Amino acid sequence: NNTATLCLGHHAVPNGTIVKTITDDQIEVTNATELVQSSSTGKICNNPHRILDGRDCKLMDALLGDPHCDVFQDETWDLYVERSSASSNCYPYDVPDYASLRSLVASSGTLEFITEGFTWTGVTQNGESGACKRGPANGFFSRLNWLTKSGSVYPLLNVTMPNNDNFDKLYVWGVHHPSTNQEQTNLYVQASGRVTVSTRRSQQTIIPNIGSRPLVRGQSGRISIYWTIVKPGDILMINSNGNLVAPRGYFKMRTGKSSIMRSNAPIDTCISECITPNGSIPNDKPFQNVNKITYGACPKYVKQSTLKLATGMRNVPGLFGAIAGFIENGWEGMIDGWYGFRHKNSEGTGQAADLKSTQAAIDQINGKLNRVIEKTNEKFHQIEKEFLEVEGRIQDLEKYVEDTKIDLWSYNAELLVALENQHTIDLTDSEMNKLFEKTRRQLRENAEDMGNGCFKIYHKCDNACIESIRNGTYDHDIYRDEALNNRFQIK
Amino acid sequence: NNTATLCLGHHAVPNGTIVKTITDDQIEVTNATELVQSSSTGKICNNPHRILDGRDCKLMDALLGDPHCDVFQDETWDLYVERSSASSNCYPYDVPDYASLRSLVASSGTLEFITEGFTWTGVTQNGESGACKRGPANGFFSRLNWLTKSGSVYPLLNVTMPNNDNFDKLYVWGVHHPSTNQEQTNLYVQASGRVTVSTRRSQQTIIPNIGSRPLVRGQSGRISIYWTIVKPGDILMINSNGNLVAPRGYFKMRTGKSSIMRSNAPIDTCISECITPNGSIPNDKPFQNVNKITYGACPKYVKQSTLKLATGMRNVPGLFGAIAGFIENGWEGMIDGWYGFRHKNSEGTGQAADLKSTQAAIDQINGKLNRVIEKTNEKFHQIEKEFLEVEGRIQDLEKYVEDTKIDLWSYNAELLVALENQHTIDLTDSEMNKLFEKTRRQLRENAEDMGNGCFKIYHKCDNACIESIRNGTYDHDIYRDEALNNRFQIK
Amino acid sequence: NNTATLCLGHHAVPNGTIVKTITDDQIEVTNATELVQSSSTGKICNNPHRILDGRDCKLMDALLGDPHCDVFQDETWDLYVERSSASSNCYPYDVPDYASLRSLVASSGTLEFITEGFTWTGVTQNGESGACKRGPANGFFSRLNWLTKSGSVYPLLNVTMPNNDNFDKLYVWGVHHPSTNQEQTNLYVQASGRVTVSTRRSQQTIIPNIGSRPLVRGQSGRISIYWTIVKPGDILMINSNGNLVAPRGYFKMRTGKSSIMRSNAPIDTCISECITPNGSIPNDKPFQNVNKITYGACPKYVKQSTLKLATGMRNVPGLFGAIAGFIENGWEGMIDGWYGFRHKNSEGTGQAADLKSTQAAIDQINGKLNRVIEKTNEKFHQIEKEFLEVEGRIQDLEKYVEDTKIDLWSYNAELLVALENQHTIDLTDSEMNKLFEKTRRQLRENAEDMGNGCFKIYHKCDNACIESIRNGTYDHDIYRDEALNNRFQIK
Ligand SMILES: CC(=O)N[C@@H]1[C@@H](O[C@@H]2O[C@H](CO)[C@H](O)[C@H](O[C@]3(C(=O)O)C[C@H](O)[C@@H](NC(C)=O)[C@H]([C@H](O)[C@H](O)CO)O3)[C@H]2O)[C@H](O)[C@@H](CO)O[C@H]1O
Ligand SMILES: CC(=O)N[C@@H]1[C@@H](O[C@@H]2O[C@H](CO)[C@H](O)[C@H](O[C@]3(C(=O)O)C[C@H](O)[C@@H](NC(C)=O)[C@H]([C@H](O)[C@H](O)CO)O3)[C@H]2O)[C@H](O)[C@@H](CO)O[C@H]1O
Ligand SMILES: *[C@@H]1O[C@H](CO)[C@@H](O[C@@H]2O[C@H](CO)[C@@H](O[C@@H]3O[C@H](CO)[C@@H](O)[C@H](O)[C@@H]3O)[C@H](O)[C@H]2NC(C)=O)[C@H](O)[C@H]1NC(C)=O
Ligand SMILES: *[C@@H]1O[C@H](CO)[C@@H](O[C@@H]2O[C@H](CO)[C@@H](O)[C@H](O)[C@H]2NC(C)=O)[C@H](O)[C@H]1NC(C)=O
Ligand SMILES: *[C@@H]1O[C@H](CO)[C@@H](O[C@@H]2O[C@H](CO)[C@@H](O)[C@H](O)[C@H]2NC(C)=O)[C@H](O)[C@H]1NC(C)=O
Ligand SMILES: *[C@@H]1O[C@H](CO)[C@@H](O[C@@H]2O[C@H](CO)[C@@H](O)[C@H](O)[C@H]2NC(C)=O)[C@H](O)[C@H]1NC(C)=O
Ligand SMILES: *[C@@H]1O[C@H](CO)[C@@H](O[C@@H]2O[C@H](CO)[C@@H](O)[C@H](O)[C@H]2NC(C)=O)[C@H](O)[C@H]1NC(C)=O
Ligand SMILES: *[C@@H]1O[C@H](CO)[C@@H](O)[C@H](O)[C@H]1NC(C)=O
Numbered sequence A, B, C: 001n002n003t004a005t006l007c008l009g010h011h012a013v014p015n016g017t018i019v020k021t022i023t024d025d026q027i028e029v030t031n032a033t034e035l036v037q038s039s040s041t042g043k044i045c046n047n048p049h050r051i052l053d054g055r056d057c058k059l060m061d062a063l064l065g066d067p068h069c070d071v072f073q074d075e076t077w078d079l080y081v082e083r084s085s086a087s088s089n090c091y092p093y094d095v096p097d098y099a100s101l102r103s104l105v106a107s108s109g110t111l112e113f114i115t116e117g118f119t120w121t122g123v124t125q126n127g128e129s130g131a132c133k134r135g136p137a138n139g140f141f142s143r144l145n146w147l148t149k150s151g152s153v154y155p156l157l158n159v160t161m162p163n164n165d166n167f168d169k170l171y172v173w174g175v176h177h178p179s180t181n182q183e184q185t186n187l188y189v190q191a192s193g194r195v196t197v198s199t200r201r202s203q204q205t206i207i208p209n210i211g212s213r214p215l216v217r218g219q220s221g222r223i224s225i226y227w228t229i230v231k232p233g234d235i236l237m238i239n240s241n242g243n244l245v246a247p248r249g250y251f252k253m254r255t256g257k258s259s260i261m262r263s264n265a266p267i268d269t270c271i272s273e274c275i276t277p278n279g280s281i282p283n284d285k286p287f288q289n290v291n292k293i294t295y296g297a298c299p300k301y302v303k304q305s306t307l308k309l310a311t312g313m314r315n316v317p318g319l320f321g322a323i324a325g326f327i328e329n330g331w332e333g334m335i336d337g338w339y340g341f342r343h344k345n346s347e348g349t350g351q352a353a354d355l356k357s358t359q360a361a362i363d364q365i366n367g368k369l370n371r372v373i374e375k376t377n378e379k380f381h382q383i384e385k386e387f388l389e390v391e392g393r394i395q396d397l398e399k400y401v402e403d404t405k406i407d408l409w410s411y412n413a414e415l416l417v418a419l420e421n422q423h424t425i426d427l428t429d430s431e432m433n434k435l436f437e438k439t440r441r442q443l444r445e446n447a448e449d450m451g452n453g454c455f456k457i458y459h460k461c462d463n464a465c466i467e468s469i470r471n472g473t474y475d476h477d478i479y480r481d482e483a484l485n486n487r488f489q490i491k
């Protein structure tokens, strides 16, 4: 009953989490959170974005109107999902700049198509083929009009179509490439055709291509597809002496957040802002490792599969030398605070959380948590990131852009966690130290630091006296004479 | 009279500034500075860069020699400013890869055109048109030479021009597409023409397509513009059996800092390194929010409109627990230093700045200031970042590259300020602590820490005595017996 | 003889190294390491990567089989090295999209060529030219087959080659453009030729353009080179009635780590993972200034020539105020630890290293060293980064992408060293201070801090006594009464 002991301590937990810092790759903290999303449900949620499942229709085939894609007439989407099993079932074609036309239609988000009354005099219209069957019958792309001779004549076609609305019109037409010279003249009479499609500030000028090619659905002929945008006040002109595969009208163009993704993931009823080819994913985390291909408000793709952000002090079951230092050891039995006090006196032993120091640590970690978890990444139509054919220069640059980006983000994420972690350990160490010092300063000359986080208080200090220390109102003058006597034999 | 008090503390100002740190979204420091440039005069300064106002001439029209653009002949520039009201008033034309021709001329910085002694045998030269009037007369592009039949013949043209110089020559030439067959033969006799322009390492062939395009300034025909760069030692050769629109010469090519910008900002007499479409901007700050399109030594575009870097300590009207810690509270009355001393003694009271500690904090903050505002970014011709027409793949990539870059820089800026600010707060705290500990150490056993940043000095300590503490020459043996006697009653 | 002195200290060296920190552009530490590789031996190491010296053969000429390039038949490479002096010595040619064909072959990493069973009925094979000699004899590209008439006939050629294998095939073929009409018909009999090469998914039809181009090795004609990829299950057709320069077979395509590099550096025996055009470089450092063009596991290209990373404490021949603070000064004579103890007692003076605290500093710096120098960047085929022609849009973008990337990495490198440096100095200061405090704490009331890193120990303290302090077993109760008596004159 002549002295007391008061020791400062901090909590610890039986199972901690290993995190990475600036100086240690493996240091144990009381608690952490995962910043990389690395899993998916495997399914694409159908809200909030308007998902159109292309099923066995590539957007291009929907656009041209391959008979097996008629259900997609006038459809709209925020995201068109294109499946890899999808195939073409009409006249064989190619699209110079396929990727661009697929991109610009993807991006526009609609197949809304308006028929117009092109006046095609002196040709047979509605040319059809065995390669584009409707049931047992010859057929063709719904949105195009294959013209051939009437009788023995294919005249110079020369028609116009003014755009008098105040949206942009997308026209999609083509040129037919016959197999032989015989075929060119049987169909179009002239030996060399040409197709000139123009506006007031643009043109396209195409000569047909001749030769035997491999049969696709019975045919060696082909069509190359071309497109033209006609602005308000402008006009489409089409001029041709053979081989024209005429548009029937225009597609409406829109701007907005629409896009296209290659995925075989099923569509499901649920809500997710972020879509990948592997399925929708949560965007509570700032990073993800699921896929570099995303649509919507998503974590940023990084190469790491896990990045643990520390949310607690170091676990002992820093710059200041208190935690894992002169305080030998955490207290697992302190479960209502991060920091506090154990005492021993005449009336027995006890333990109290310190609230102010506990809150200061938690506040500061919440602050870096709020900065870090506060999501800022919403992207829609972007670039292609996987490729089905080898191409060279353009594809090289596309991959290299993305590869560059991913390494830069991966690095920022790696650094950020290592920094934030070092700093969390150290600021938690600091708060412990600051409490100890605050206590030392209250004791003035009535106590000595025992070297282990505890002070020997050189006077009778009951539970009320000890509380006075914990709440910061200890009055050292009251006890000085007594203490100095025990401490130094003064009087 | 028989003891003194010496208190430490630090300055404070009535109204400080709110900054962001690693741990707080909002925390007040004495002084801060803005790192985002977000305003502009609206006007483009005419030095130190050579600014050429294109007015109503697109560079393309200046290049080709639209008669309304004659004043631009042989012009030079560091930056050609292109206006939106600019329009074309010559023969209607298209330029496949318009943007490459525009880019490489913009980058070359010059329209210096050298006229060469081309021989066109058997053809009529200087064809003209109602679409490209020169006063009351029909006219044409100054830089091109429209060739037509002579009498009843248009010969196979085969003409060459060696490059015997040590610089690259840019040849701009064209191909004429007539309206009808009648026109093709009236002009060129041949039913189908053709141009082939070749060097030892390159060849281009264009076949014109006859036909009607929309009436522009009275004309249905068109001209398409192509280009060839001939290296030193190489030879230009031109081959044509009709439809050639010949070069009269070439443009000198330069490399350097030149570029082109779209803007309607007026030009003004002033000095700015950095130009944006919105006007020139100062470049003392390291970031800006005005426009992603810049020319010259510019702050880097970031998404944030403001980012305040702290240039002073925390304002109290840290890891170390001194400032806003055991020192309750700053001193508004301390105006000649950041840190100092106040005392109560025998001869009255007083205050003095500590210079060493004030300087060390200031120096450290100036150090990071120099790092951060040190102008390092000078960029000239880049990629276009705004587009008037939809194009697909290539535009997608250009937008993605810029948007990637901006996000990465906005991040760097965000983190930097957050880091710098946490560390400034903490280093200013440390300096206060270091000074207090310095003082405690000098006092030895002659004073006691009162716990609030002050020492009770247990001896008569007059102004000279106090000064000896502030200048670090206090001799504790002189006072020790006196002090130990008042603390401990030794005598 | 009734007291002793015990000072704590740290090492120093006469000449240290200057580094950059957050707050000082120049401050001296004991030791540092360079993080930018700036030297090369100048030679390209021939392990571990398979390096193929193109010598005087551009890869394109090895691919087509220029007679001077027969030694490259069926060759493979991880890196094909292309020399400046390399030249073409065969029929002069051009390759639309040359760079993609060169890219995709470079990336495939092989010239393995499989001859196939094309049946050329009615025509003569193996056309040769004086412009492509094999010694004294006229010759031709080995991989191509120049077809011409047989007797008085050249028929319409129509062949197929199915792909029944499970890999992709690369077909490289050409079209000959004669200099005159005479030549056209002597060779091919038709006045105009045509080559149509097709698959189910693609068609290319080239019309030769007759006429003179500049004489190259005695020839005014040219051949144009095209390529077609045939996937498994698909079918190559070739259809032509003149001017076809046919393939003899195909090149095997592969995916993997191959590329091509332009360099005049000699190849030689050594081992380096990272290749630049200047020669190989070590990859122990995380950045390099040698060249933005690299192959293999390389340090990342940055703009700075040097970045010195501190591996040691501040050198004195911090946040905490010990090093270059209350310890005036380091000890050059302390060679077997970073921190330690000097004393003076009755038995004389001495000195001893502190191992725990030395290790803790070292360990933590080793840890950030391992984070930093951990080689994590391995790249192979990328984008071209230097260009020999002006091109416009695409090249602008390519340059912009690499320039963007470099400035971001150079920023990360600058920040990293400034951060880690500030932090190293601070953590080394901290460890000093922690040792001081540890020592203070053991001494309890038996010593006083002299203000300069030393303690006055107020009792007889022999060498064994001193060692008890250094090893942490000093028992203060043995000495307390004696010490209080000399400090005060009391207990
Ligand atoms: C007349 C006939 O039945 N001939 C038999 C041949 O079949 C025809 O062969 C030609 C090619 O020589 C075409 O492939 C014909 O197919 C169509 C098709 O695509 O389905 C028929 C269409 O009506 C026709 N459409 C139009 C608008 O012209 C179309 C086009 O002409 C071509 O696609 C243009 O490329 O072709 C096919 O019916 C068979 O080739 C011959 C061989 O021995 O046997 C004949 O009995
Ligand atoms: C004066 C007039 O308007 N006459 C009537 C016809 O207009 C003519 O129509 C022809 C088309 O066949 C051309 O447009 C003529 O204009 C020019 C031009 O561009 O201005 C005249 C130039 O001399 C000529 N220049 C050259 C070097 O040939 C030029 C070119 O041929 C074309 O630009 C090539 O495409 O054409 C124009 O004068 C009117 O169309 C007709 C029927 O109503 O009656 C004419 O008498
Ligand atoms: C000054 O600092 C440099 C950089 O830290 C020190 O050199 C480094 O020293 C370590 C230990 O000697 C080297 O690591 C060792 O390498 C081998 C394997 O390569 C292994 O046997 C060890 O376990 C260890 O990891 C390190 O590679 C080396 N770094 C460099 C660039 O040389 C140097 O020791 C310091 N000098 C002084 C006087 O402290
Ligand atoms: C371990 O750390 C996580 C991350 O801070 C804590 O989870 C948060 O808890 C708070 C308080 O209830 C919530 O408001 C957050 O939204 C939760 N965030 C996350 C990411 O899960 C968790 O509280 C911590 N565990 C302990 C014992 O403190
Ligand atoms: C050119 O060659 C192709 C390939 O042999 C020929 O097409 C084949 O002809 C038969 C009969 O019409 C078809 O059953 C085959 O499927 C065809 N093969 C392919 C790959 O399409 C074509 O007939 C030839 N052309 C000429 C004019 O002789
Ligand atoms: C092709 O059609 C166009 C458009 O109808 C014709 O051009 C028009 O011609 C009339 C009479 O010359 C003009 O008054 C109109 O301004 C023209 N319209 C446009 C948009 O140019 C053109 O003459 C026709 N071409 C042929 C060969 O008959
Ligand atoms: C087109 O003109 C060129 C150059 O005048 C002719 O090519 C030259 O022909 C002579 C032989 O007649 C060579 O010795 C020269 O070296 C050639 N010069 C070049 C630059 O190639 C070419 O013959 C002409 N073509 C025709 C059909 O007249
Ligand atoms: C996402 O998809 C690709 C293949 O399409 C796969 O390589 C990757 O591992 C997938 N990730 C997950 C988490 O399923």
Ligand SMILES: *[C@@H]1O[C@H](CO)[C@@H](O)[C@H](O)[C@H]1NC(C)=O
Binding pocket: B031, B032, B033, B311, B369
């Ligand atoms: C605040 O900061 C800037 C940058 O250091 C400085 O130039 C300015 O004078 C400072 N203001 C005050 C009141 O110190």
Ligand SMILES: *[C@@H]1O[C@H](CO)[C@@H](O)[C@H](O)[C@H]1NC(C)=O
Binding pocket: B038, B039, B040, B277, B278, B289, B290, B291
């Ligand atoms: C600069 O211009 C852009 C587009 O013209 C505009 O949206 C932006 O608000 C402008 N900013 C300033 C600061 O003038």
Ligand SMILES: *[C@@H]1O[C@H](CO)[C@@H](O)[C@H](O)[C@H]1NC(C)=O
Binding pocket: C038, C039, C040, C278, C290, C291
């Ligand atoms: C590497 O080569 C480049 C250009 O080829 C040159 O400018 C650079 O200085 C070279 N580096 C070294 C270390 O020689």
